[PDB]
């Protein structure tokens, strides 16, 4: 039934493309495993890049230290603002 052969011819086109890609991907799975352990050995051999760790770690800590003190500032700023808001005039003038 004629037209089916054409479709079959097309079907099997990939099939070929895809299997070539699948072979590639299978190898890539190996390659990723081949990048990762690898790192496992690097971790077995050296001091796991602790310097970068502490430097990146600190970057965020400072950004968080800022948030904590900014909190402390809004708190103190307003505790004092409001005390002055009332207290300077608590007797109004007496």
């Amino acid at each position: 039934i004629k037209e089916l052969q054409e479709q079959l011819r097309n079907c099997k086109e990939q099939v070929h493309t895809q299997e070539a890609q699948l072979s590639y991907l299978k190898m890539q799975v190996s390659n990723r495993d081949g990048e990762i352990n690898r790192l496992k050995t690097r971790l077995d051999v050296g001091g796991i890049n602790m310097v970068k760790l502490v430097q990146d770690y600190n970057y965020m800590q400072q950004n968080d230290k800022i948030k904590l003190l900014n909190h402390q500032i809004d708190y103190l700023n307003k505790e004092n603002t409001e005390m002055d808001s009332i207290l300077r005039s608590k007797p109004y003038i007496a």
């Binding site: 990762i36 352990n37 496992k40 971790l43 077995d44 001091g47 796991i48 602790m50």
Partner: protein, 54 residues
């Protein structure tokens, strides 16, 4: 200077290496745990065939 070094000596001889080996193994686990996730993805791949007929 020596005491600052001693604090570091303690850190470097007894803390960092344990934390490092623990990190090592635990990163092997998060590497490999992501990979175990990929194993359940394979469980999904099995499912994905059953669902063809579905």
């Amino acid at each position: 200077n020596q005491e600052l070094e001693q604090q570091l000596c303690i850190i470097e001889k007894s803390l960092n290496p344990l934390k490092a080996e623990n990190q090592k193994l635990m990163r092997e686990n998060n590497n490999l745990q992501s990979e175990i996730i990929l194993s359940s993805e394979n469980a999904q791949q099995k499912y994905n065939l059953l669902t063809v007929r579905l």
